Structure 1
Amino acid sequence: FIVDVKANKHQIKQAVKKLYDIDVAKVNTLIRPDGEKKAYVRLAPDYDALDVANKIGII
């Protein structure tokens, strides 16, 4: 995901959990050379990423 530079890892985890009613294993955040924060969100093993991406709209 792309998030704003004012978000903690805890905030990103909570936002994903509320929005997409899923579980998050961990979060890794970096700040792109162009300015916004990029977040890699690793889900729980019992959730697969492909179906969540389906529900999102990106396939």
Structure 2
Amino acid sequence: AMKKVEDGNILVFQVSMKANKYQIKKAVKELYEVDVLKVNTLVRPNGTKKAYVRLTADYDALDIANRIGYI
């Protein structure tokens, strides 16, 4: 996940099972003040949902990761 932050400019979140791609794009844009290029989702083998949130070129995922708390 930390590799995917730096290279592809992609934030990796654990999203709840009920929420779709519109709701992830809306959630990130609301909470983190950052526009989203695309969201890709997959159901994890354990039963939860992973989400690959790629941000637009005007925003950096490394900076926002240092902004929230995880690095």
Could you tell me the TM-score, scaled by structure 2's length? 0.80
Q: Which residue of 2 aligns with 1:14?
A: 26
Say how many residue pairs are matched.
Answer: 59
SS in 2 for 1:45: coil
Stretches of structure 2 that go unaligned for 5 or more consecutive residues are: 1-12
Moved over 2 A (4+): none
Counterparts of 2:43 and 2:68, CA distance in 1: 23
Could you tell me the TM-score, scaled by structure 1's length? 0.96
Query: RMSD value over aligned CA atoms?
Result: 0.5
How far has the Cα of 1:12 moved from its partner? 0.4
Q: Which residue of 2 aligns with 1:26?
A: 38
Stretches of structure 1 that go unaligned for 5 or more consecutive residues are: none
SS in 1 for 2:50: strand
